[PDB]
Write a protein that binds this ligand. Structure first.
Ligand SMILES: [Zn+2]
Length: 132
């Protein structure tokens, strides 16, 4: 009942009605190497030494088709922080949002970490969306 107007999270099913196409990707920030501590799937984690040199980078590579999901887990608390930095860059430039549509994942990888063994293991490089 009125809860889907850009800049919002989507439930497991909410992903069905949309599922635009590969144009979607999940952004994460913390260090990447310090977050996984092993392997992983989907969503790419990045630094934050600039906080603005990462969204100009994404803005420069909008690729036209672009859907962005932030956090990678379930916005347990950092989600708002994700938007916080979004504001930081947008503050540096203005009306940034290199992404066509920004939303937050309902599951991300909370089930895997929380109730799906520690973290992805395997022994490959391109294993899953993002495995470090
Ligand atoms: Zn893996």
């Amino acid at each position: 009942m009125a809860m889907a107007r850009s800049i919002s999270y989507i439930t497991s099913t909410q992903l069905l009605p949309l599922h635009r196409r590969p144009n979607i990707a999940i952004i994460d920030v913390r260090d990447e190497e310090r977050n996984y501590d092993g392997h992983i799937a989907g969503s790419l984690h990045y630094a934050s030494g600039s906080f603005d040199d990462k969204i100009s980078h994404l803005v420069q590579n909008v690729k036209d088709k672009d859907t962005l999901v932030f956090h990678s887990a379930l916005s347990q608390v950092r989600g708002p922080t994700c938007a916080r930095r979004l504001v930081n860059y947008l503050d540096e430039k203005k009306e940034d949002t290199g992404i066509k549509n920004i939303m937050i994942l309902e599951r991300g990888f909370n089930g895997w970490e929380a109730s799906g063994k520690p973290v992805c293991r395997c022994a490959e490089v391109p294993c899953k969306g993002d495995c470090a």
